Structure 1
C-alpha cells in the first residue's frame, strides 16, 4: 500500500516526535514466510494486520493503523 509510512513520518515531524520505528516479525516456512509489523511512535505501539508476504506490506499496514488511531 503506497503511502501510509510517508504520511506517518510527516505526522511525526509536524508534531516534533522521532521518526516512527518499525519492528518486523517473520514466521512460517523459510520460503512461505508471513510478516507482521509494529510501528512505534511517541512511545505508542501500533500493530499491523498479520500474514503479509513481505516486510514493506506489514510496515505499511502498521502505519495505516497508527494514522487511523491518531485521528480518533
Structure 2
C-alpha cells in the first residue's frame, strides 16, 4: 500500500524520470487479472501476477523494484 511512492521518491532523490507503469489486463472482464512492470531508469521489473485491481498490480511491481534497489 506504500511502495508506489517510496520509489517515486527514489526518482526524486536521483533526478530520474517518474516511474512508467504497465498493466497486463487479461481474463473475463469481470474476473480481470493484472500483472505489472515498472520501467524506471528504463529498467523493467515484473510484478507477481494475478492481482484483482490495477493498484495491487503496480504495488507488487513497486514492492519488487525496491527489492532490487536495496542491492
Q: Provide the alpha-carbon RMSD of the alignment.
A: 0.6
Give 4+ residue runs of structure 1 displaced > 3 Å after superposition.
none
Gaps of 5+ in 1: none
Query: Matched residues in 1 for 2:61 and 2:47: separation?
Result: 4
Calculate the TM-score normalised by the size of structure 2. 0.96
Deviation at 1:54, TM superposition (A): 0.6
Q: What is the number of equivalent residue pairs in this alignment?
A: 71
The two structures have a TM-score, normalised by structure 1, of 0.95
Structure 2: gaps of 5 or more residues? none
